[PDB]
């Protein structure tokens with residue numbers, strides 16, 4: 001698909017058996033989901049946004065299905081107000097910016 | 100231009116006679132630049148990212164050249180660690196996401 005940017009680029013994701021909506025976010029290095037429980041061990045991480053920092057849990061090698069495309073990667077979980085798909089996962093689904 | 104997402108999608112901008120690098124940011128509704136002086140009056144605005152909120156100055160009808168494409172729009176100025184080109188200006192330069 002081509003997605004124009006007149007509205008937020010929200011897509012449906014399936015992760016750990018759950019369906020969510022997530023924002024395709026070229027400005028995010030990382031993928032950040034709201035609180036959910038996930039398989040494997042994790043490590044603590046601080047990530048900086050625009051207003052300051054949040055604490056997250058880093059899960060590696062997590063399966064995510066983004067708009068019907070499977071990707072495996074690092075997913076951070078914590079108190080973000082919107083689910084964010086970052087560049088780490090967009091590269092895996094062949095996602096480009098164009099003009 | 101096709102831009103892939105293996106690295107940050109940084110482009111060169113010209114605004115207020117100055118050259119800056121800015122991130123093409125599909126996850127930003129608005130355009131936010133580091134501290135700089137700008138024409139016309141402004142209004143105070145609060146914007147919220149990950150980590151919380153920052154205070155900015157909102158300037159309307161500001162000319163910006165993004166990767167050589169002219170756009171006119173709202174530019175927010177304040178303590179962001181990175182210049183961000185948001186959707187409001189991306190739409191003006193014909194910028195899409197694709198996969």
Ligand SMILES: Cc1c(O)cccc1C(=O)N[C@@H](CSc1ccccc1)[C@H](O)CN1C[C@H]2CCCC[C@H]2C[C@H]1C(=O)NC(C)(C)C
Nearest residue numbers: 027028029030047048049050082084126127128129148149
């Ligand atoms: C800049 C901006 C607006 O003008 C309007 C609405 C949101 C935002 C905003 O902060 N957007 C952010 C997503 S986080 C987000 C939060 C709320 C709603 C939607 C997205 C950016 O797209 C990403 N954003 C761009 C940039 C913001 C300035 C500081 C450094 C990066 C931080 C990076 C970021 O947060 N990365 C994470 C891995 C932590 C997710």
